[PDB]
Design a protein around this motif. Sequence first.
Motif, short mmCIF file in Angstrom:
data_model
loop_
_atom_site.label_atom_id
_atom_site.label_comp_id
_atom_site.label_asym_id
_atom_site.label_seq_id
_atom_site.Cartn_x
_atom_site.Cartn_y
_atom_site.Cartn_z
N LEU C 85 0.81 -1.21 0.00
CA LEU C 85 0.00 0.00 0.00
C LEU C 85 0.85 1.27 0.00
O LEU C 85 0.61 2.19 -0.79
N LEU C 86 1.85 1.32 0.88
CA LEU C 86 2.67 2.51 1.07
C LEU C 86 3.56 2.82 -0.13
O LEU C 86 3.97 3.96 -0.34
N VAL C 89 0.67 2.71 -3.75
CA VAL C 89 -0.37 3.73 -3.77
C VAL C 89 0.06 5.06 -3.16
O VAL C 89 -0.04 6.11 -3.80
N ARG C 103 4.76 -0.01 12.51
CA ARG C 103 3.77 0.50 13.43
C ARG C 103 2.38 0.12 12.95
O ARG C 103 1.48 -0.14 13.75
N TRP C 104 2.21 0.09 11.64
CA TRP C 104 0.91 -0.19 11.02
C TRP C 104 0.43 -1.63 11.25
O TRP C 104 -0.75 -1.86 11.53
N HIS C 106 0.33 -3.30 13.52
CA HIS C 106 -0.25 -3.52 14.84
C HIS C 106 -1.67 -2.99 14.99
O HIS C 106 -2.37 -3.34 15.94
N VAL C 107 -2.11 -2.16 14.04
CA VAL C 107 -3.44 -1.53 14.13
C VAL C 107 -4.39 -1.91 13.00
O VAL C 107 -5.59 -1.65 13.08
N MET C 108 -3.85 -2.52 11.94
CA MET C 108 -4.65 -2.94 10.79
C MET C 108 -5.61 -4.07 11.15
O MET C 108 -5.20 -5.06 11.74
N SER C 109 -6.87 -3.92 10.75
CA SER C 109 -7.86 -4.99 10.92
C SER C 109 -7.80 -5.94 9.73
O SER C 109 -7.22 -5.60 8.70
N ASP C 111 -10.46 -6.89 8.05
CA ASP C 111 -11.34 -6.25 7.09
C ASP C 111 -10.54 -5.36 6.14
O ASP C 111 -10.65 -5.48 4.92
N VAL C 112 -9.73 -4.46 6.70
CA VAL C 112 -8.86 -3.64 5.87
C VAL C 112 -7.96 -4.52 5.01
O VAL C 112 -7.91 -4.33 3.80
N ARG C 115 -9.63 -5.88 2.03
CA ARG C 115 -9.90 -4.84 1.06
C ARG C 115 -8.64 -4.48 0.30
O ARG C 115 -8.70 -3.98 -0.81
N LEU C 116 -7.49 -4.73 0.91
CA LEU C 116 -6.22 -4.37 0.28
C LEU C 116 -5.78 -5.42 -0.73
O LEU C 116 -5.12 -5.10 -1.70
N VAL C 119 -7.90 -4.19 -3.69
CA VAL C 119 -7.36 -2.92 -4.18
C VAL C 119 -5.96 -3.02 -4.79
O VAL C 119 -5.64 -2.33 -5.76
#
Lengths: 140, 140, 140, 140
Positions: C85-86, C89, C103-104, C106-109, C111-112, C115-116, C119
Amino acid sequence: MNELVDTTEMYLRTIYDLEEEGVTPLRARIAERLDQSGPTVSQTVSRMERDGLLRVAGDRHLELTEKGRALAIAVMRKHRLAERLLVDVIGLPWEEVHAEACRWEHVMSEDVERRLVKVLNNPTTSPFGNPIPGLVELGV
Amino acid sequence: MNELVDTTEMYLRTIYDLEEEGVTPLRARIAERLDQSGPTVSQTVSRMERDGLLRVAGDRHLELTEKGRALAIAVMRKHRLAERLLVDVIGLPWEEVHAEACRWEHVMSEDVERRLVKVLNNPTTSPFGNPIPGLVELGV
Amino acid sequence: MNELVDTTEMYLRTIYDLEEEGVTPLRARIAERLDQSGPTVSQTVSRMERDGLLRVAGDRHLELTEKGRALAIAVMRKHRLAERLLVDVIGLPWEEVHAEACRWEHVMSEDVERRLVKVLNNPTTSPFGNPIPGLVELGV
Amino acid sequence: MNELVDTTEMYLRTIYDLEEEGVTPLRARIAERLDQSGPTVSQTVSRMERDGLLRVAGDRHLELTEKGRALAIAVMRKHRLAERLLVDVIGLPWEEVHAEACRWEHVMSEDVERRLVKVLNNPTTSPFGNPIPGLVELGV
DNA sequence: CCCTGTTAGCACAGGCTGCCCTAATTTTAGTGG
DNA sequence: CACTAAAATTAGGGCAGCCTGTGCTAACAGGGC
Ligand code: NA
Ligand code: NA
Ligand code: NA
Ligand code: NI
Ligand code: NI
Ligand code: NI
Ligand code: NI
Ligand code: NI
Ligand code: NI
Ligand code: NI
Ligand code: NI
Ligand code: NI
Ligand code: NI
Ligand code: NI
Ligand code: NI
């Protein structure tokens, strides 16, 4: 070296002071008197439960086991015997004796304790008037 | 509590011991004397070097700094005054007073040392014959 | 917030990385990699073993439990999708993506995450070539 | 990890929210919205007051310092740039983007924020219509 | 019974340093060739 | 220089004992409905 010289013995003595003063022994009291954080005294008190020196009651009162009471008494005994040596013999000024004795209590042998009972002419009290515990258990 | 009571002090005084006896102060000597492993001794010595208490010299000898030396002398002094006090006043058996004094040296304030010098009639030696160091800088 | 954001997860993902490089997972490797003290990692590792995430072998190897490896895989999946993604996109410079993805993760669900996969056109590798694990068990 | 991920930032951003809404920022309000106990938020507020993040006014209204305000602005900005990203690019169902951006706001670097400003063709509002603050400070 | 907050006494997570260990090497000083 | 013995290091731990941060319930206080 710890500032407490011996942490465990300082926890036991503190609980014992509390019992002498007629206040309820709580971890919160130990943190106040020894200037430690709650997490610190909680963890240390757990180690002492593990080693069978105390137990946390259902209502969170700290109780000395038999092993913990025997040790606490031993330390209080050395403390007040040290206080006497320091005042009667050495002449260390009054406002310094407790502080000094608070270190001495953790290093004096019972060998020396028994000699002191003889040398100081069978003292039943500290120079402040507080009774000295465990003289029978010392063997006097 | 630490068997040594104060590791740093016992390390400084042990270095004093080796110098007094005329043996080259090496980490390997402390390991023998204090019965600890090499890795432990180098690790502690590193902390003490970090803290300004000694240096590991180019040829490996351990030279006390000025701060290190003052402390080493202060501890040896308390030890021998404790030895005197235990023999002359307390009457502890010879066999045992060194063991005892090896713990007291770590808790005795200079305030007590000064009052001991008087109590012991200006002693200049331990009961085993060795001289008592740092009586000058103690302020007498 | 933690500097690690999630200590347990970072520990898992660190174990994962080590396994992936073919280096034996030891507490020492984690201490090096996350720049933490030895007792800190051994204590954290203890909690993770308490909680069914791993165990310390007799020869001190860290063994992920089935649950532990599932979480470990799940975090790296988030890490590597975040890198795609980083770069594909968002266009973050190549030098700073792992840091951000670290860091990410650890917070990504999930569901996200799902979707990735859509995408990003069913991606199967990190921008750096490494495969994205856990896609099948994701819901793909 | 913490459920809030970063407690301080969630306290700052929550105060900011109330100010946007024109409701009086009280600790009771924070307790309500983050679902914590009076004591917890009272303690957390004093750490932040301590660290110069906020003032508790004579009338008990919580008030951001210029340092506290700058951090609240930065988290809100991250929260809303994330929301944009979640709807416009990723396509996460509406009912779920606030929960996701409630975690992402605490881990997004400004480096990513500036890329999101470019890639989302200079957004000024969240997909819910709320204006994104701190775009100037961000460096755009 | 709310409301808003405080004081007391805990909980767990996750950090630290000090000071102790074994196994297995490696470096260094001194000795002999 | 080459082997050796003493000395120190390297690698990976152990446990004791400090800490702050961030969460909780109970009891209470002052006012309100
Ligand atoms: Na403290
Ligand atoms: Na560290
Ligand atoms: Na609650
Ligand atoms: Ni009770
Ligand atoms: Ni006293
Ligand atoms: Ni004491
Ligand atoms: Ni030399
Ligand atoms: Ni001696
Ligand atoms: Ni000693
Ligand atoms: Ni193995
Ligand atoms: Ni990466
Ligand atoms: Ni990470
Ligand atoms: Ni106001
Ligand atoms: Ni939102
Ligand atoms: Ni948030």
